Amino acid sequence: TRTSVLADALNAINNAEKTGKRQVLIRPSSKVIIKFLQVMQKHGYIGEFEYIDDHRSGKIVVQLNGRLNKCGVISPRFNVKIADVEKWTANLLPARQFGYVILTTSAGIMDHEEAHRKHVSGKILGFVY
Amino acid sequence: GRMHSKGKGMSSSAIPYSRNAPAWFKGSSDGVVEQIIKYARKGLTPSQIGVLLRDAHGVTQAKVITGNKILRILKSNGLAPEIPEDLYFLIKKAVSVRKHLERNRKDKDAKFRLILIESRIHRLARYYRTVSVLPPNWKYESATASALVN
Amino acid sequence: GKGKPRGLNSARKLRVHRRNNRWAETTYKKRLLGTAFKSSPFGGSSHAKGIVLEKIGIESKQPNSAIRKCVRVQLIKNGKKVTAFVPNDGCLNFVDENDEVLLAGFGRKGKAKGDIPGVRFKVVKVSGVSLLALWKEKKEKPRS
Amino acid sequence: MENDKGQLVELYVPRKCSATNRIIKAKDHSSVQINIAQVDEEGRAIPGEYVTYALSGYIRARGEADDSLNRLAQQDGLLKNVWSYSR
Amino acid sequence: STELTVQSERAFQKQPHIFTNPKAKANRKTKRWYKNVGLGFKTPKTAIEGSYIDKKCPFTGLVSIRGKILTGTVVSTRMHRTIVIRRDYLHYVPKYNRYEKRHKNVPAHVSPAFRVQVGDIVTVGQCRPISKTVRFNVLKVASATGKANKQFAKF
RNA sequence: GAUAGUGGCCUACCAUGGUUUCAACGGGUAACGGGGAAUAAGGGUUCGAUUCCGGAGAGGGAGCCUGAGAAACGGCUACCA
RNA sequence: CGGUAAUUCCAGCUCCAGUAGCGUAUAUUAAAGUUGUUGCAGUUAAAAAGCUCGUAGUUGAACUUUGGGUCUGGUUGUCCGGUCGGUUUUUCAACCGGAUCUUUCCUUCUGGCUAACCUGUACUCCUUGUGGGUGCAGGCGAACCAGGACUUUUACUUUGAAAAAAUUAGAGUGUUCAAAGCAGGCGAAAGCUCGAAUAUAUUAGCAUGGAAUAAUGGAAUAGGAC
RNA sequence: AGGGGAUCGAAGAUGAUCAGAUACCGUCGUAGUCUUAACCAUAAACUAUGCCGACUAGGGAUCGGGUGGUGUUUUUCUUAUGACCCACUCGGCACCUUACGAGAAAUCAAAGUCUUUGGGUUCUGGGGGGAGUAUGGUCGCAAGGCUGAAACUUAAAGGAAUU
RNA sequence: GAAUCUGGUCAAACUUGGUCAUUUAGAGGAACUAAAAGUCGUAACAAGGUUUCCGUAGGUGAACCUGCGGAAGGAUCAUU
Ligand SMILES: [Mg+2]
Ligand SMILES: [Mg+2]
Ligand SMILES: [Mg+2]
Ligand SMILES: [Mg+2]
Ligand SMILES: [Mg+2]
Ligand SMILES: [Mg+2]
Ligand SMILES: [Mg+2]
Ligand SMILES: [Mg+2]
Ligand SMILES: [Mg+2]
Ligand SMILES: [Mg+2]
Ligand SMILES: [Mg+2]
Ligand SMILES: [Mg+2]
Ligand SMILES: [Mg+2]
Ligand SMILES: [Mg+2]
Ligand SMILES: [Mg+2]
Ligand SMILES: [Mg+2]
Ligand SMILES: [Mg+2]
Ligand SMILES: [Mg+2]
Ligand SMILES: [Mg+2]
Ligand SMILES: [Mg+2]
C-alpha cells in the first residue's frame, strides 16, 4: 500500500535533490501534492513543474533548482493550534529565521508564516528547510 | 502486492489514453449492446462476454463504445447473476477443493490452500454485504456453498 | 517506520505499549510492585535502628585484603538480621555488644559496597551518639 | 548576511557549482574550477577572457560529471549538438 | 417501541389528569394529550395518530427534555421500549498528541412514536431520570430507511 | 410503596436483558480527589497526608432522637473491641 | 590506594571547594534519546514470533469550482516633514479583508419598515449648468425582526464565553534592599490622588467564523428532483 | 495402538586404547529408523535481516513468461514449427564492482533515503547472573510447551575490529 | 399517655463452615549465588588434540557422551 501520497511525492524529490537530479517523476500526484508544490514555488524552492493529466490518476514531473535541502512531510497530520505552530517551527526548521512549515488550513495549504499572518492554522503537512 | 503469496506480480491489462471511440473501428453502439445481451442469454459471465466482444468483434471496452459498463448493461436488461461473478467463481473453486479434500484425507497443502480460498471468500462476502449485493447476514462456506454453485 | 504507529487515532496502542515496556526498567518496577515494603530489610526508610547482636569481622573481597569489622544487627521494626559495617579505625571500642544502633544505607541504592561481601549498611548513631562524633571525640559515649 | 543597516558580514561567500547549485564547500578537496577559452578566427584564443565553470566535488565523485559539463557548455554556447535534452 | 396490545398490564393504564367525557358526542372518542417537545424537533404524528400510553415518552407523557441533546448509533434494541445508543468519540492523550476511539453506551428510553432498528443514528435528549441507568429519551431516529424501499438490484 | 422529590430506591407481576479485548468483572494500591509541588529548552516525569476547594471519618460496626439542616459522635441507643 | 620512598590510611602542615552553613543515608526529578509522541534499539552487542491465515485495532489511490478581472477598506514602510520629538495625504508597493459578475447564488417565503433611488410628479433657489433636493400614486429588501419550513453528520481550526482564589508568569510600587506585601504617592507640608493590572493553564461541554485536511451520506426496482 | 522390521543404529552388551574410558575407534544389538491411525509445536525452525509500499547506481550472468529480429540452424522442395543467437522487457533466486549513503565496525543497493530525526503497520529488548528457574495459570496420555517472577548477586557481561 | 406486648423492619453482633492474603513457626527437602592457595577430571577457547553449536531422546562421578535432524556462530565464500 502507498498509504500516503504526499509522503511518496516528497521522498522521491528529496532523493533526487540528494543525488543532484534536475528532475523528478512523481507517480500518483494529487490536488494536495500540487498545492504543496505551488507553495514551494511561491518562495522559490522548486522550478517549473508539469502535471501530466493521465487519463487515470496523475503524474508530476518536477524541475529542481538545487535550492532544496530537505522536504519533509510529517507522519500523522497533527492538528495544530496557533501556539503549537511556534513549537513545531522551533523543532522542524533550521532557524527562528527562514524556511517554511507547510500546514494545511481551512483557508488552504499555506506555509506557516502566511498562516500566522492570516491568523489561521490547522493540520500540518510538510516543511521545506 | 498479491493477496496471498509472497509473489509480487505486475502482469496486468493496460488501458488506452482515449476515453473516446477508436475512430475507424465501425459498427455502432446498439449492435454492441445486442451482442452483449445475446452473450448474456447464452450463459456467459461478464468478463467472458467482454473477451468475446474484444477479439472476434470490433470492441475495445464496452464503456468506450456504449457509454455504460458490461455489468451495468446487464443490470439494466435484468440478466446479471445473483452472486457476483468473481465471488461465484471463488465459491466454485472452494467447492472443488472441498471435494478433493473429501477424497484425500492426508493432503495438508490442499487443506491450507482451501483455508486461503475460504478467507478470500469471506473478504469478498463482507464487501458484497457492505455494498449490498448479497442480502445481509448471508455467509458462504462449506455446506450451503455447494448448493449455491448450481 | 519502525514499531510505534506514527498513527493519529493510534494512541491507546501507544499508551498500552509504553505501560508494558516500562516494567523492564528496574526502578519503576521496584516502585510499582512495592519491593521496598515486602523486602530489602529497611521499610523503604533511610535509617533504621537495630540491636548489636554479634560483632563479625567479614573477610573482604578480592584484590583487597583485610577484615571488615561489621556487626550482625537485628532490626527492631521488621526483625531482620542484617550485617551493618562500622566505619573508621576500630570504633567497635564504641559499639560493644547488645547495644541499640542506628544504621544507614551505603550509597549504592541498596546493593553491595566496594569490597565488603554480604554487607549493605553503615552504622551511624551508636546508642544515640553517632560514630563519627565518638571517633573524633567531638562528643562522647553515655558511660554504659 | 547583512547587519541591519547595510554592512555585509559572512565572509568567504561560497562558490556554488554551476551544474548542481550545491554549495562548493571550504575543504572541497574534490571540486574543480573549469576554465574554457573565449575564441576567435585565425590563431586567436583571446587571453584573459574565459567562460568559466565550477563543478562541485560530489557530482564528479558520483561519476556523472562529463555530461553535466557538456550541458553547461551547450547552454553558454561553447558547444552545439554534443549534448541533447532527451536521452 | 411497545408493538401492539395497547392495554395489557395487570393494571389498566391511561394518561393522568386527562379524561374522556362519556356525556359529550365525539367520533374520535378518546382525547389524546400530546406535547410539543420543542428544540426544533417535529413531534412525530405516530403519537397523535397513536393509541399507546407510555409514561416515559417525551410527547405523550410527563417527561420533558432539558439540558443535553446528543446523537449516536443504536447498538441494541433487545429490550422493551428502550434502546442502547453508543456515542463514539475521540479522546485525546497529550503525551502522544493523539486519539482514542472511545466506547460509552447511553441507554435511552424510546417512545413507540418511532420504529428503531439496529444501526440507526438517534438524536437523543436528556431528561428526568427514567430508571437506574436510563436518563435519555430517543427524540429523532433521523435515518428513515437507509435503503429499505430500494434494496433490490434488478431494474 | 417509599421519599422533600426522580428513580430497582423496595415490593407485586411480566419480559430477558445489561457490561465486556475501544479491557467489563475481579485483584492490588505502601490511592482521599482536585487546585497544585518539585523539577530551568521542547515534549515531559515523578509528588500531591499539608495552609484553598470538595469528600469521607470520629475506636469499630450499627441504630436513631431533636431540629431548617445531623444518621451528629465535645447527642443519645445497643453490640463488639 | 595499603606487601617498609603510601600524592589515596592515620596524624601535622600548607591548600581547594562551599560557607552560617556543609556533609552522610534513602527516595525522587534532571542528567536518561538508559522507556524514546517529539526521540531509542532488534544481522552479529538484548531483542524480528517457525510460518501463514485471520477478527477487533491501527492505516488507506486519486477524483468533485479552478481560475481570472472589476471595484472597494484596513498595515507597514518608502518620500518629505505640512509642523512648536510627533502629525497626514498624494508618488508607491507588498499585505490581509470584503463586494462582485463571470458558464456560478446566500436555506426559503409569508409582512413588517422599505433606507435610498431603478425612480419622476411640478420643475427650479440658482455661476450661461446633471454644482443642489423639501417632495407623493406603480416599485431594490438584507439595514434585522418573528414566524414557519428543514436543515447530511462529525473530527479539525480561529475568535468568543466561562476554565474560584492562592500558587506560576507578569504591570506598578523604595518591604533600608531582598524574599515579600498590596500598597503607597504628592501638596500651602491649612486634603487630593492613582491603585490593586494582564496572561496562560489547550483537555469535556457551549457559542461563532473557516471550509483545505480526514472521514461520512445523498438520484441506478429511482417510492429521485422541481 | 496396529502392522513392516533391510540397513543403520539411543540403550545395552563387548573388544581394545588409556593412570582411568559404562568416551572417542571395532563387533553384535532391542527402541527407533519406514508406515497407517492419532498426538506433541518445538530447532542455529538462520538470510541469525517482521511484513507492505515508494525511491535512489551501475553491471553482466542465471531461471520463469512475453514481444522485436528477411539472424543462425534442423530440410521432408518454399517451409511451418522447435533448439540456439542478438536486443529488450516484466517476475524471481542470487551474485560482482563501486559508495556518491549507511553503520560502532565487520560490512550493506539495502542494514540506504535518520539530529536535515515523521510512508503504514505487527511484534520483541532494556547491564550481566539468578533464570527461561520458582510459583500460578493453562494446552499436553506423559516427556513437555506457551506464558514467566522476585529475592538475592556482581562492574562488568557483551559486540566488531587491531596489535 | 407510662412501662409492657403481638407483627414487621433496619439490623450490630454471636455460633458455624468454607475462600483468601499479609505474616511468622517450617520436622525435612533440593536450589542459587558470594567467598575462589579445597577434591577429581579437563569440558570449552588453537582442527583445544572426537570442530563447535542448536532441537530432541537415552545414558550416566562430574564436566558430559551418544543417537537422529538441523545449523555454521567452521577449519570450506573454489571445479570447465
Ligand atoms: Mg493522586
Ligand atoms: Mg491534596
Ligand atoms: Mg497515609
Ligand atoms: Mg483512637
Ligand atoms: Mg462535632
Ligand atoms: Mg455516629
Ligand atoms: Mg610517607
Ligand atoms: Mg533531555
Ligand atoms: Mg538503548
Ligand atoms: Mg543475540
Ligand atoms: Mg510571583
Ligand atoms: Mg572398555
Ligand atoms: Mg556403550
Ligand atoms: Mg523458539
Ligand atoms: Mg529467530
Ligand atoms: Mg534483563
Ligand atoms: Mg581433528
Ligand atoms: Mg577439551
Ligand atoms: Mg574438543
Ligand atoms: Mg551471540
UniProtKB/Swiss-Prot annotation, chain A:
It holds the Pfam family Ribosomal_S8. The keyword Ribonucleoprotein applies. SUPFAM superfamilies: Ribosomal protein S8. Keywords: Ribonucleoprotein, Ribosomal protein. InterPro entries: Ribosomal_uS8, Ribosomal_uS8_CS, Ribosomal_uS8_sf. GO terms for molecular function: structural constituent of ribosome. GO terms for cellular component: ribonucleoprotein complex; ribosome. One of its GO terms (biological process) is translation. PANTHER family: 40S RIBOSOMAL PROTEIN S15A. Belongs to the universal ribosomal protein uS8 family. This is Small ribosomal subunit protein uS8. It comes from Kluyveromyces lactis (strain ATCC 8585 / CBS 2359 / DSM 70799 / NBRC 1267 / NRRL Y-1140 / WM37). The gene is RPS22.
Swiss-Prot record, chain D:
The keyword rRNA processing applies. GO terms for biological process: rRNA processing; translation. Pfam families: Ribosomal_S21e. It comes from the Eukaryota. Keywords: Cytoplasm, Ribonucleoprotein, Ribosomal protein, rRNA processing. InterPro entries: Ribosomal_eS21, Ribosomal_eS21_CS, Ribosomal_eS21_sf. The keyword Transmembrane does not apply. It is found in: Cytoplasm. Belongs to the eukaryotic ribosomal protein eS21 family. Required for the processing of the 20S rRNA-precursor to mature 18S rRNA in a late step of the maturation of 40S ribosomal subunits. Has a physiological role leading to 18S rRNA stability. This is Small ribosomal subunit protein eS21. The gene is RPS21.
